[PDB]
Design a protein around this ligand. Structure first.
Ligand SMILES: O=C(O)CNC(=O)C(=O)O
Ligand SMILES: [Mg+2]
Ligand code: NI
Ligand SMILES: [Zn+2]
Length: 331
């Protein structure tokens, strides 16, 4: 069995290997990359996502989210308070302000210590989940707006044509902006490209151990667990690496820098934080190996998780027993 300790693997494809996205995902899996839940892909030196980032300041962040925490430093939830719209240029200036800027630090490890010590005492503002793309249309390799669609994958594997579309999302971050512990909708893959700016630190639980994280989460968030049998679908709970180590939960960590891709694999729980002003792009995708994970994915039916139009068909076709109850949650 390849990668039996479930370590995060880093890949350096050549330009020729960067042509065929599906084939390279399958290659990475042949080497055991999925066992970690997360892999890093460093593009060939010949490649670029676009020519420059000099002209992005007029993108609008219609609903910036202030991430307010509650709890203790290592075990907290966050809620998203909606703020007034601002441009990417306005948001960058805000991120760099004395109130929000990254503190002085020695190295990524020192910053990570500072994050876990101090996150809860601040409320950073995240421009998340903005439909759009920063890939140039002429970038033909690993262009996250030109991937094969999940609807087309389901149709190719299972024969059923379904409605829905699959487009990317932009994320504008600042120091302390946080992504809570989650798997993807329908336990899909994700791919995330860090276009610019400061790094993003990730934490990940191997898919084979995901239920260990869920059981800890039910213990640590006992009201939320009574409310919803899949409350990590709400994407609000944080658990620090120190707490995970104290409870014996297997995980790994890695820092993504600008110009690098990360892939999350089906049922790989992940969480993390931004080091400073940055912009990432991400999208879900599927492969043939995903189908079995999609059929087994948990679902939130309490009403909180409320998701995209395109998840309807995935539930309806892969999880017909759950469909009725899930859809009651969405209406
Ligand atoms: O970058 C972020 O805030 C969160 N991204 C992801 O969870 C992802 O790419 O799957
Ligand atoms: Mg612009
Ligand atoms: Ni994710
Ligand atoms: Zn729920």
């Amino acid at each position: 069995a390849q990668n039996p300790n479930c370590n995060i693997m880093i890949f350096h494809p050549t330009k020729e290997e960067f042509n065929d996205f599906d084939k390279y995902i399958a290659y990475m899996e042949s080497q055991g990359a999925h066992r970690a839940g997360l892999a890093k892909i460093i593009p060939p030196k010949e490649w670029k996502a676009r020519e420059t980032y000099d002209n992005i300041s007029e993108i609008l962040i219609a609903t910036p989210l202030q991430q307010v925490a509650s709890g203790r430093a290592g075990v907290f939830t966050q809620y998203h308070k909606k703020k007034k719209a601002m441009t990417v240029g306005e948001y960058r200036h805000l991120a760099n302000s004395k109130k929000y800027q990254t503190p002085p630090h020695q190295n990524f490890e020192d910053l990570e210590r500072k994050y876990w010590k101090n996150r809860i005492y601040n409320s950073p503002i995240y421009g998340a989940d903005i439909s759009g793309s920063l890939f140039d249309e002429n970038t033909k390799q690993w262009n996250l707006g030109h991937l094969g669609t999940i609807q087309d994958l389901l149709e190719k594997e299972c024969g059923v044509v379904i409605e829905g579309v699959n487009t990317p999302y932009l994320y504008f971050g600042m120091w302390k902006t946080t992504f809570a512990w989650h798997t993807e909708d329908m336990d899909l893959y994700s791919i995330n490209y860090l276009h610019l700016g400061e790094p993003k630190t990730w934490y990940v639980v191997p898919p084979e151990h995901g239920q260990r994280l869920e059981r800890l989460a039910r213990e640590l968030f006992p009201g939320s667990s009574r409310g919803c049998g899949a409350f990590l679908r709400h994407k609000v709970a944080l658990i620090s690496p120190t707490v995970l180590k104290e409870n014996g939960i297997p995980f790994n960590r890695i820092t993504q820098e600008a110009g690098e891709f990360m892939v999350t694999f089906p049922y790989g729980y992940h969480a993390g934080f931004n080091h400073g002003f940055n912009c990432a792009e991400a999208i879900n995708f599927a492969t043939p190996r995903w189908i079995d994970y999609g059929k087994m994915a948990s679902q939130c039916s309490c009403g909180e998780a409320r998701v995209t139009f395109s998840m309807d068909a995935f539930v309806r076709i892969l999880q017909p027993e759950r469909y009725d109850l899930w859809k009651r949650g969405q209406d």
